[PDB]
Amino acid sequence: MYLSIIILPLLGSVVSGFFGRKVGVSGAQLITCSSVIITTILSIIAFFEVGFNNIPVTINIFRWIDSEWFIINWGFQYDSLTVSMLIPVLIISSLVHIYSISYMSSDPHNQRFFSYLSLFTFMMIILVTANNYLLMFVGWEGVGVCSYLLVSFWFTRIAANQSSISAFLTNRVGDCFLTVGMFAILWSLGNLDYATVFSLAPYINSNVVIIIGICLLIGAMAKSSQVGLHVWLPMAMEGPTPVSALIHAATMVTAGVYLLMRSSPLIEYSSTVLLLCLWLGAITTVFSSLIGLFQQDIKKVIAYSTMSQLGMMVLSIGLSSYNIALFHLVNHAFYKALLFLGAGSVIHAVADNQDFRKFGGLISYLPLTYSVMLIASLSLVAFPFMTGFYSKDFILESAYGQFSFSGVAVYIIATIGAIFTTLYSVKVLYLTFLSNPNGPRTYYRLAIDNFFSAQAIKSYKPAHEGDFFLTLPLVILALFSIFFGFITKDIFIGLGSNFFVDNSLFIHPIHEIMIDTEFAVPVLFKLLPFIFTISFSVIALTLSELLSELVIYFKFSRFGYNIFGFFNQRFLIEFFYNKYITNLILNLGGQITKILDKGSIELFGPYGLERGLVKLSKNISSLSTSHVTTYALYILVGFILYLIYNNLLLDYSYLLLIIILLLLLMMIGE
Amino acid sequence: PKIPYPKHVWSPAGGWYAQPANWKQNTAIFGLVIFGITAMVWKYSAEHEVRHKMPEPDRFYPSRYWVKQIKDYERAQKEK
Amino acid sequence: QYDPPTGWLWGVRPGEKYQNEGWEGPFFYGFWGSLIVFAIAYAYKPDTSIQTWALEEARRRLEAEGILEDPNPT
């Protein structure tokens, strides 16, 4: 069974993509969705078997690379971590598969589409089910190619093309550091099977832990978009929304998070990497939450929410608390999926518009869609007693529980990021739903008012909600975003939970903060985010639809104008990327291939030797005037010089220099 | 509406709005293949699933009926 | 609606069929034929790799220690 949940998603995709001609659009959907659904059902069984009963299972099909000490197998290991990883991956992938049945009945190429999402599902199981780092890299690069293939799904979009390049190229930038890190693992241990790296890790050199740990830290940044390796994610949203839900909200961008958790037995023996895991997590936590506030696209705003929750995931990794990271991980996935899926039905309601400047009302038009997005946002903002409450809030107490300077320092950074989390959370809810209409008439012109004489049959299209296939995933995630947090709180968080007892997530007693997270923290700090959440929201409710003047006054001030533009344009980071990184590469290539290759390399080489040797030989041909007296004088001169060379006992260097001098005055014309 | 497109362009994934009249029996024909090699995988998986901790008989355990590493153990334990 | 699937595989129109240039018989029966037969032979080709030989010795080598309890005591 355990090897079956690897094969099925692969099998649907090849029939969908290579025989999609012979199964048709609806057949491609039925095959792949069922394959995902079947894989979903067995995944939850493995969670009940691998984790609850504490039996990890090993599959070793055959060898992949076999060179001396290096025996990498196509082998698969299920343990407590990978069954937990496979729950959000498989629940959401199925729902997104159903969500796309409604989503893309108008898109022509609909069965190339359904194969990519089932090919994405296959490689995410490969990533998490591996025995070793190298096989993980197959699911690693495999989701990266699946993402490129989906970002540029509308490949006649030039925008999708540049976005696909950015996603593909940026993830390679991290994959270099990941690959170099695995070279350090192979060098210092002789293999990279997980059982072998972690058993030996408590004895290896400290400095090899940092060098290995650092390399996988950069690799985590590219997949899990961080403060530097993120430019690929916000414009990865050029793909269809089903893609962004499964891949760019909940699954692919936590690959780096999963790597940090999986490697916890290894990285736990060097506080340095955990220190950067902490500070980088808060810096990216606040860097992202600020950006989304000033975004005039619902897809691009909710994209930036993904990075912010991702940022808090890395923070807990640096907290040496991976159980919280996994708990928050899965919990963030469920509601965040709904947030994009809720937005997706919104985009279908309007004529595929994405700007907030022409969104409003829609309360009566999209009642169900509003209800779910509120449910998701409340768990996103960590409203108390929700799915996201236990997962998102516990972090801050865990951050504050570690009574160190860094822990308290990022508590402020996380909290101010949480403050801005509220701001865009209501901004999406307000502008789209709780505000005056800002689009054209057709978005809201119902049939209750006649307003038409001969066009009563058509022209209404007043932004109705979707059908069953579009709404069913919304309802399913809605239940999880309410209750799933409380049900599994002891499963992952607990206080002395023995769920992770097969050394799946290793934690060292020297930096335990679990007891301090619940006891030593003052009560005010425990409920402080709740105070800020309920408070800072009403100011936004006060600043819009109640006053709607202070925000305009702040905009047009010279100090306020630039702060809007600076944060809108993503801290000018891509500006500093395109001009001074990639345009630099494109000009070094220009210098090399013009000045050097088709340049000096040829001139100080074939073309130069060609040009001068032709001239040198025309000159020596010039002496061949075919007149007998000139020829006799040439013979007598050579007769003289051979006598000079011999009986004078000249050093041979003069003769060489005389010849070079003659050859190179023969080179000189006239 | 429907985007116009060439009718000569053979695609392996189908083309623009591809669906054959026989999208069902062909789907059934392919569906048997997926099932056929899935249990084929399940057989090999059930034969190579190696474990080290044995489950309690009381606990719910779906794999007690197909896997080998514990079915032999369970009947071996049924000897006293 | 959903359009019937169409296209001209190999560029051969529905009226006509594909015409051979003469490479096909050598490529499918000769080139691809030989390799497939070779694939059959390889599954029978005896294992003569240094790993396999060294496994056996190293398997005996550890048997004169605690690790790898020998099936047959000496």
């Binding site: 025989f19 001609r21 | 054959p20 009249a21 062909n26 090699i37 | 019937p4």
Partner: peptide, 17 residues
């Protein structure tokens, strides 16, 4: 209205497996 044949490719892959 037109029908798609299983096609020689389907038999080669299934036959090969």
């Amino acid at each position: 209205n037109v029908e798609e044949p299983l096609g020689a490719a389907f038999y080669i892959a299934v036959g090969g497996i």
